[PDB]
């Protein structure tokens, strides 16, 4: 049987060098250390789901330094404007091994 | 920094000329959003068109004249404000000219 | 017939919640905005290439905000100790459209 | 929160077993080593599949919930292992330390 291991979800704001362009902003949601490889990631803004057109979820790949565990990315690209208005974005990660079968993280410019 | 001022007609078009110093740099026009206190990109050679300007902006380059041209069509009153030509990966710091456009009915 | 477009390389530091764990640190290299999907991403530290054991490079996926353009992420995972000693890490990206067919970005603890 | 302290002794090439409190709440469980100069406690082993590189293959973490205790056994001891350690729980390893363990490896 495949062991159940909880995912760790870290949420990273766009890099400062990307925001200097004043074009679009990329928010990355990092899901690591989970088993089985099956994982669901969804993005929400203002308590409402975003169109899947706006983000891409990577396929879960094996974490090389932890054999039985996997990782995956979900990259959301919005605009620098919205990021810098103060909009709050939420990454929702669903996985079999989580206590409540779901967890979420939230980020904006004010975190750091 | 140089300054120019433009006047356009509602529903008409305007052409903004900006200097083109280097061929292998980022070339952009930005709009100074007073609420944010920063200059947000309206068009660039990095395939970015602001949503409010989508379908209404064209960027053409003429290195033999050391200038690049930003033509804005289908003007609206919300376009009135202070803009800026620029180059580089920093939109606020890198700036070459200031353009003020007012759309008059 | 299609145009060749240069990659933009952004580099993201480890999350504070990961370093608070005092275990391992994840440095993410984000390569965006290139049109020829063929790209090589490798990591170097102390002027020396890193073992591929330590990093994973994602597959080029279509960029949602620009058709005809792709993106890829590369995760380097090191010990927290190396990161907090001040070690300087460099992401090396090779692509046809680059002036020397290669470009680099660099992060350390002091960058962000 | 001033942490209690214990002292352990192992032999060169031998082993030592460190006893640690086991919180009844299902938390992350770790033993860390306070690296002097850095001012922080770096994880040597944890229940979050992390073993410090210098201790990989020579450290074991075993749980005994009926005794409210988990055991960290370090084998193939060396002089570099002598120092101050700490049992702990939680996602912050520097904080949330629960007890302090000082190890002296002697010939």
From Swiss-Prot, chain B:
**Top-rank lineage group of the source organism:** Eukaryota
Processing and modification events after translation: Phosphorylated on both Tyr and Ser residues.
| Induction of expression | Regulated by circulating IgM levels and immune cell activation signaling. Down-regulated in activated T cells, effector memory and central memory T cells, as well as in activated NK cells. Transcriptionally down-regulated upon TLR9 signaling. Down-regulated in response to IL7 and IL15. Down-regulated in old age.
Q: In which tissues is it expressed?
A: Expressed by CD19-positive B cells and CD4-positive and CD8-positive T cell populations in primary and secondary lymphoid tissues (at protein level). Among B cell subsets, detected in a subset of bone marrow pro- and pre-B cells, in most follicular and memory B cells and in a small subset of germinal center B cells (at protein level). Expressed at lower levels in CD56-positive NK cells (at protein level). Expressed in lymph nodes, lung, thymus and kidneys. Very weak expression detected in spleen, liver, heart, and salivary gland.
Region (CDR1): which ranges? 21-26
Q: Indicate where the modification Phosphothreonine is found in the sequence.
A: 73
Disulphide bonds in the chain = 18-85, 30-39
Which cell locations does it reside in? Cell membrane; Early endosome membrane; Golgi apparatus, trans-Golgi network membrane; Lysosome membrane
> What does the comment on domains in this protein's record state?
The Ig-like V-set domain comprises three loops analogous to the complementarity-determining regions (CDR) of Ig variable domains, which are responsible for engaging IgM. Mediates multivalent interactions with the CH4 domains of pentameric IgM, facilitating receptor clustering and signaling.
Other remarks on record? Expressed in lymphoid cell lines such as Jurkat, CEM-T4, MOLT-4, HB11;19 and Reh. No expression detected in nonhematopoietic cell lines including Hep-G2, HEK293 and HeLa. Detected at high levels in chronic lymphocytic leukemia cells.
Indicate the quaternary assembly: Interacts (via Ig-like domain) with IGHM (via CH4/Cmu4 domain), both secreted and membrane-bound IgM; the interaction is glycan-independent and multivalent theoretically involving up to eight binding sites for the IgM pentamer.
Q: What's the stated role of this polypeptide?
A: High-affinity Fc receptor for immunoglobulin M (IgM), both secreted and membrane-bound IgM. Primarily regulates IgM transport and homeostasis. In lymphoid cells, enables exocytosis of membrane-bound IgM on the plasma membrane as well as endocytosis of IgM-antigen complexes toward lysosomes for degradation. In mucosal epithelium, mediates retrotranscytosis of antigen-IgM complexes across mucosal M cells toward antigen-presenting cells in mucosal lymphoid tissues.
Q: What name does this protein carry?
A: Immunoglobulin mu Fc receptor
Organism from which the protein derives: Homo sapiens
Name the encoding gene, please.
FCMR
Span within the full-length protein is: 20 to 124 of 390
UniProtKB/Swiss-Prot annotation, chain D:
Determine the domain of life of the protein's source.
Eukaryota
* Effect recorded for residue 95 to A: Displays reduced interaction with IgM
Ranges where the record places region CDR3: 89-98
Where, by tissue, is this protein expressed?
A: Expressed by CD19-positive B cells and CD4-positive and CD8-positive T cell populations in primary and secondary lymphoid tissues (at protein level). Among B cell subsets, detected in a subset of bone marrow pro- and pre-B cells, in most follicular and memory B cells and in a small subset of germinal center B cells (at protein level). Expressed at lower levels in CD56-positive NK cells (at protein level). Expressed in lymph nodes, lung, thymus and kidneys. Very weak expression detected in spleen, liver, heart, and salivary gland.
Q: Does the keyword Secreted apply?
A: yes
Post-translationally, this protein is described as follows, namely: Phosphorylated on both Tyr and Ser residues. O-glycosylated. Sialylated. O-linked glycans regulate trafficking to the plasma membrane.
All residue ranges annotated as the Ig-like domain in the record: 6-106
Q: What's the protein name?
A: Immunoglobulin mu Fc receptor
Question: Which gene carries the instructions for this protein?
Answer: FCMR
Give from-to of the shown chain within the full protein.
18 to 124 of 390
């Amino acid at each position: 049987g495949v062991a159940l291991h909880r995912p760790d979800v870290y949420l990273l704001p766009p890099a400062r060098e990307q925001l200097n362009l004043r074009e679009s902003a990329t928010i990355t949601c990092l899901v690591t250390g989970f088993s089985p490889a099956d994982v669901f990631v969804q993005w929400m803004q203002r308590g409402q789901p975003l169109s899947p057109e706006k983000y891409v979820t990577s396929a879960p790949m094996p974490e090389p330094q932890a054999p039985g565990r996997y990782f995956a990315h979900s990259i959301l690209t919005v605009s620098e404007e919205e990021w810098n208005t103060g909009e709050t974005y939420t990454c929702v990660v669903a996985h079999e091994a989580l206590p409540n079968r779901v967890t979420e993280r939230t980020v904006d410019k004010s975190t750091g | 920094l140089p300054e120019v001022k433009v006047e356009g007609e509602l529903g008409g078009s305007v052409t903004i000329k900006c200097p083109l110093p280097e061929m292998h740099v980022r070339i952009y026009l930005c709009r100074e959003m007073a609420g944010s206190g920063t200059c947000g990109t309206v068009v660039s050679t990095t395939n970015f068109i602001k949503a409010e300007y989508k379908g209404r902006v064209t960027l053409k380059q003429y290195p033999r004249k050391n200038l690049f041209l930003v033509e804005v069509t289908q003007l609206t009153e919300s376009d009135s404000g202070v803009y800026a030509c620029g180059a580089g990966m920093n939109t606020d710091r890198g700036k070459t000219q200031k353009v003020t456009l007012n759309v008059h009915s």
